[PDB]
Amino acid sequence: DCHLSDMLQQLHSVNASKPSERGLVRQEEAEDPACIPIFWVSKWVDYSDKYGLGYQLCDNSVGVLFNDSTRLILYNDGDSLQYIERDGTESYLTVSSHPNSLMKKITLLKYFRNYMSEHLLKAGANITPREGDELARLPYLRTWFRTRSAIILHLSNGSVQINFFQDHTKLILCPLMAAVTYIDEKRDFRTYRLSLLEEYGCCKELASRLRYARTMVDKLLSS
């Protein structure tokens, strides 16, 4: 929420400058590899019908956001778990020493993991997380919502990701880095610092997506 405003400000700033209206666009000049995200959502599934949204992060961990506002995370050692109650109460469990209080939720989470692992592609497969801050911790899904054109994912670390259904283009916005990772229809990705896009500009496609982005942040912000 404090971070959504940072983003909002950042997007207001880059959109306000009409990046695609420069006499000459020098998009490659806005690139900044030192900003590459650490985590993003590589794949997801929706059971918000009877349970919730299951998703996998880039580092292969799997997480679930249940309709009852609780989150269960399974780290990539296929065993360590972290349950997060609505009030924010965090607690550690292990699938090896599978509890009794969450057997149902662990079995569900195991079903999603198997499903995402059998049918789903891994977004950003060709991206390499950066050697970012080490005191930073793995984020969980804060909240998500869909539109007719895209899905919007809000991560506890401040990042917001928008996956567009039709063309498969994605955006990964980080208010801490003040950068945007764009993944075009050809699966090629690039990271830019928003202030630089403000200076050098960008193409029509990235710009309309940054306008749609301020819109979705506004929706996240007023909910």
Binding site: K43, W44, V45, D46, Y115, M116, H119, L120, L121, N163
Partner: peptide, 6 residues
């Protein structure tokens, strides 16, 4: 869609 890209 109900899940991300296959």
């Amino acid at each position: 869609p109900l899940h991300s890209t296959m």
